[PDB]
Design an enzyme around this catalytic site. Structure first.
Site, PDB file in Angstrom:
ATOM      1  N   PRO A 185       2.412  -2.887  -8.622  1.00 16.12           N
ATOM      2  CG  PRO A 185       4.134  -2.639 -10.169  1.00 16.12           C
ATOM      3  CD  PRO A 185       3.826  -2.477  -8.713  1.00 16.12           C
TER       4      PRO A 185
ATOM      5  CG  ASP B  42      16.346 -10.077   3.028  1.00 17.56           C
ATOM      6  OD1 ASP B  42      15.965 -11.209   2.638  1.00 17.56           O
ATOM      7  OD2 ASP B  42      16.917  -9.876   4.138  1.00 17.56           O
TER       8      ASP B  42
ATOM      9  N   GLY C  18      14.634   2.211 -11.182  1.00 14.45           N
ATOM     10  CA  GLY C  18      15.926   2.723 -11.588  1.00 14.45           C
ATOM     11  C   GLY C  18      15.851   4.144 -12.126  1.00 14.45           C
TER      12      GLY C  18
ATOM     13  CG  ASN D 266       9.668  -6.191 -10.156  1.00 15.44           C
ATOM     14  OD1 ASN D 266       8.776  -6.827  -9.571  1.00 15.44           O
ATOM     15  ND2 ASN D 266       9.942  -4.907  -9.882  1.00 15.44           N
TER      16      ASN D 266
ATOM     17  CB  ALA E  45      10.292  -3.538   0.177  1.00 16.87           C
TER      18      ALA E  45
ATOM     19  CB  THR F 222       7.107   6.140  -5.796  1.00 20.14           C
ATOM     20  OG1 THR F 222       8.172   5.933  -6.741  1.00 20.14           O
ATOM     21  CG2 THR F 222       6.761   7.615  -5.755  1.00 20.14           C
ATOM     22  CG  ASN F 223       5.970  -0.233  -5.337  1.00 14.60           C
ATOM     23  OD1 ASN F 223       6.767  -0.890  -6.025  1.00 14.60           O
ATOM     24  ND2 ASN F 223       5.264  -0.775  -4.342  1.00 14.60           N
TER      25      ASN F 223
ATOM     26  CB  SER G 123       2.159   1.325  -4.409  1.00 23.35           C
ATOM     27  OG  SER G 123       3.167   1.016  -3.461  1.00 23.35           O
TER      28      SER G 123
ATOM     29  CB  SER H 154       5.764  -7.283  -0.125  1.00 24.02           C
ATOM     30  OG  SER H 154       5.751  -5.878  -0.294  1.00 24.02           O
TER      31      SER H 154
ATOM     32  CE1 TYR I 233      11.467 -12.770  -8.456  1.00 23.10           C
ATOM     33  CE2 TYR I 233      12.076 -10.462  -8.285  1.00 23.10           C
ATOM     34  CZ  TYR I 233      12.432 -11.788  -8.400  1.00 23.10           C
ATOM     35  OH  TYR I 233      13.768 -12.114  -8.473  1.00 23.10           O
TER      36      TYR I 233
HETATM   37  C1  LIG Z   1      13.002  -6.754  -8.476  1.00 21.20           C
HETATM   38  C2  LIG Z   1      12.216  -5.823  -7.592  1.00 21.20           C
HETATM   39  C3  LIG Z   1      11.368  -6.343  -6.616  1.00 21.20           C
HETATM   40  C4  LIG Z   1      10.656  -5.468  -5.793  1.00 21.20           C
HETATM   41  N1  LIG Z   1       9.800  -5.966  -4.827  1.00 21.20           N
HETATM   42  C5  LIG Z   1       9.112  -5.093  -3.991  1.00 21.20           C
HETATM   43  C6  LIG Z   1       8.271  -5.570  -2.984  1.00 21.20           C
HETATM   44  O1  LIG Z   1       8.132  -6.787  -2.799  1.00 21.20           O
HETATM   45  N2  LIG Z   1       7.585  -4.676  -2.189  1.00 21.20           N
HETATM   46  C7  LIG Z   1       7.727  -3.315  -2.368  1.00 21.20           C
HETATM   47  O2  LIG Z   1       7.113  -2.522  -1.648  1.00 21.20           O
HETATM   48  N3  LIG Z   1       8.562  -2.836  -3.357  1.00 21.20           N
HETATM   49  C8  LIG Z   1       9.259  -3.718  -4.161  1.00 21.20           C
HETATM   50  N4  LIG Z   1      10.098  -3.212  -5.135  1.00 21.20           N
HETATM   51  C9  LIG Z   1      10.211  -1.719  -5.295  1.00 21.20           C
HETATM   52  C10 LIG Z   1      11.425  -1.112  -4.616  1.00 21.20           C
HETATM   53  O3  LIG Z   1      11.251  -1.251  -3.231  1.00 21.20           O
HETATM   54  C11 LIG Z   1      11.476   0.369  -4.961  1.00 21.20           C
HETATM   55  O4  LIG Z   1      10.266   0.977  -4.538  1.00 21.20           O
HETATM   56  C12 LIG Z   1      11.608   0.589  -6.464  1.00 21.20           C
HETATM   57  O5  LIG Z   1      12.422  -0.420  -7.034  1.00 21.20           O
HETATM   58  C13 LIG Z   1      12.216   1.968  -6.735  1.00 21.20           C
HETATM   59  O6  LIG Z   1      13.522   2.014  -6.194  1.00 21.20           O
HETATM   60  P1  LIG Z   1      14.833   1.767  -7.118  1.00 21.20           P
HETATM   61  O7  LIG Z   1      14.732   2.608  -8.373  1.00 21.20           O
HETATM   62  O8  LIG Z   1      16.047   2.235  -6.349  1.00 21.20           O
HETATM   63  O9  LIG Z   1      14.984   0.285  -7.431  1.00 21.20           O
HETATM   64  C14 LIG Z   1      10.800  -4.084  -5.952  1.00 21.20           C
HETATM   65  C15 LIG Z   1      11.652  -3.579  -6.932  1.00 21.20           C
HETATM   66  C16 LIG Z   1      12.362  -4.443  -7.740  1.00 21.20           C
HETATM   67  C17 LIG Z   1      13.272  -3.875  -8.792  1.00 21.20           C
HETATM   68  O1  LIG Z   2       6.297  -8.545  -5.979  1.00 20.53           O
HETATM   69  C1  LIG Z   2       6.308  -7.693  -6.891  1.00 20.53           C
HETATM   70  O2  LIG Z   2       6.395  -8.089  -8.065  1.00 20.53           O
HETATM   71  C2  LIG Z   2       6.552  -6.352  -6.618  1.00 20.53           C
HETATM   72  C3  LIG Z   2       5.965  -5.719  -5.528  1.00 20.53           C
HETATM   73  C4  LIG Z   2       6.129  -4.337  -5.356  1.00 20.53           C
HETATM   74  O3  LIG Z   2       5.665  -3.752  -4.372  1.00 20.53           O
HETATM   75  N1  LIG Z   2       6.820  -3.585  -6.300  1.00 20.53           N
HETATM   76  C5  LIG Z   2       7.351  -4.219  -7.422  1.00 20.53           C
HETATM   77  O4  LIG Z   2       7.961  -3.580  -8.277  1.00 20.53           O
HETATM   78  N2  LIG Z   2       7.148  -5.573  -7.604  1.00 20.53           N
END
Ligand SMILES: Cc1cc2nc3c(=O)[nH]c(=O)nc-3n(C[C@H](O)[C@H](O)[C@H](O)COP(=O)(O)O)c2cc1C
Ligand SMILES: O=C(O)c1cc(=O)[nH]c(=O)[nH]1
Ligand SMILES: COc1cccc(-c2csc(N/N=C/c3ccccc3C(=O)O)n2)c1
Length: 364
Positions: A184, A67, A274, A113, A64, A251-252, A182, A88, A115
């Protein structure tokens, strides 16, 4: 589709021109237009997984947050992901936090991030998914399921009602739904992970879900933080088993800042993702798998950029994995790379398939 070209030349140069948010938006545009190499990698039967009431032709999904609004789903399957998670999504549209709100830590292969759930809202995403609903039904039948990640509005008074709305509106369009408690970056959100609030929240969510017609009835998963205490984790495992939650996403991003981060922007507020998140995530998977006795499907996510990273999460107890941050550094070829390396490592270690590897570490 050359990993080396994308990793060593194309991605770095594009990052040189564009701030991370601009780069993200452009990436979404390119992806939705199919402007990418169609996969060299043809999925092996070893990579197939059956879980959550669905077949997944490979266990590597897009997390997530890439997109957020359901704009690039088909381009993401073309990129080779075995499943796609959008969101989300919040009930009403909202802008999210002021810019800048996304930061690269190239020296750490990490991103931060904040956002804040920028979202087109349920109505817009509903119409978008409806427009391709029957195409999705075929994709799903073909082993390419779709997940929808649900959030809550910043100004909402009733968190549970925000999620319930999400279940009612996007539930019928999803193979699985994710209750994201989850993030933050939304005030008070992560405290929904505490026992009493979680039980009340998930009971309402499951009721709404059960009220949907059978063919439109998604699995419900909870996405949790990597920053939970042992008590939090025990409680979540307990609630998940008491209520019959279908799975966990682990995890998130982390609000922690592990020692050793070198990136100039390491002290920016937000969730870190990352490489520095990788083992923290793997350990959380390991712990949740044990607490749920290996009976609750886990989607593992956090710092995956190679077959080994994926396999470590699978052996720790994940039935599926997702990635996001790795894509921002390596580009689209990382997906085939991870799949190809995972298959080779499964053979090297004597697994007949991904399924045999799930939780293998716990049976050592
Ligand atoms: C820029 C960004 C935006 C994200 N937005 C969401 C989100 O909207 N909802 C969510 O559940 N996780 C969100 N995540 C978390 C990712 O889904 C994932 O849990 C987290 O980045 C760990 O995976 P990764 O190390 O491969 O990036 C976001 C992560 C990043 C980097
Ligand atoms: O929208 C966000 O900023 C966002 C949501 C989420 O679940 N995880 C994250 O890293 N950012
Ligand atoms: C090189 O051509 C293509 C084609 C399709 C997708 C991509 C693609 C997928 S992700 C991506 N860059 N993403 C960058 C990004 C995304 C979210 C958050 C931060 C960043 C960033 O730091 O640049 N680019 C690239």
């Amino acid at each position: 589709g050359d990993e080396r070209f994308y990793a060593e030349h194309l991605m770095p140069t594009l990052q040189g021109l564009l701030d991370p948010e601009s780069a993200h938006r452009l990436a979404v545009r390119f992806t939705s237009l199919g402007l990418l190499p169609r996969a060299r990698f043809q999925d092996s039967d070893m990579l197939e997984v059956r879980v959550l009431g669905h077949k997944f032709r490979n266990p590597v999904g897009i997390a997530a947050g890439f997109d957020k609004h359901g704009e690039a789903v088909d381009g993401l399957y073309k990129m080779g992901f075995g499943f796609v998670e959008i969101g989300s999504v919040t009930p009403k549209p909202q802008e999210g936090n002021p810019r800048p709100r996304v930061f690269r830590l190239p020296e750490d292969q990490a991103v931060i991030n904040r956002y804040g759930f920028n979202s087109h809202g349920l109505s817009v995403v509903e119409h978008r998914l409806r427009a391709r609903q029957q195409k999705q039904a075929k994709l799903t039948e073909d082993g390419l399921p779709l997940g929808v990640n649900l959030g809550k509005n910043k100004t909402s008074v009733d968190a549970a009602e925000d999620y319930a709305e999400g279940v009612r509106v996007l539930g019928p369009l999803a193979d699985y739904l994710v209750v994201n408690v989850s993030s933050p970056n939304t005030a008070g959100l992560r405290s929904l992970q505490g026992k009493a609030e979680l039980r009340r929240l998930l009971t309402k969510v499951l009721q709404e879900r059960d009220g949907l017609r059978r063919v439109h009835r998604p699995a419900v998963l909870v996405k949790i933080a990597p920053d939970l205490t042992s008590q939090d984790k025990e409680d979540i495992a307990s609630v998940v088993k008491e209520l019959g939650i279908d799975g966990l996403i682990v995890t998130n991003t982390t609000v922690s800042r592990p020692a050793g981060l070198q990136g100039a922007l390491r002290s920016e507020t937000g969730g870190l993702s990352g490489k520095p998140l990788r083992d923290l995530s793997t350990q959380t998977i390991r712990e949740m798998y044990a607490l749920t006795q290996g009976r609750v499907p886990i989607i593992g996510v956090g710092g995956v950029s190679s077959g080994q990273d994926a396999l470590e999460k699978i052996r720790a107890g994940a039935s599926l994995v997702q990635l996001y941050t790795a894509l921002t550094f390596w580009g689209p070829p990382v997906v085939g790379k991870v799949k190809r390396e995972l298959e080779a490592l499964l053979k090297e270690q004597g697994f007949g398939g991904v399924t045999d590897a799930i939780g293998a570490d716990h049976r050592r």
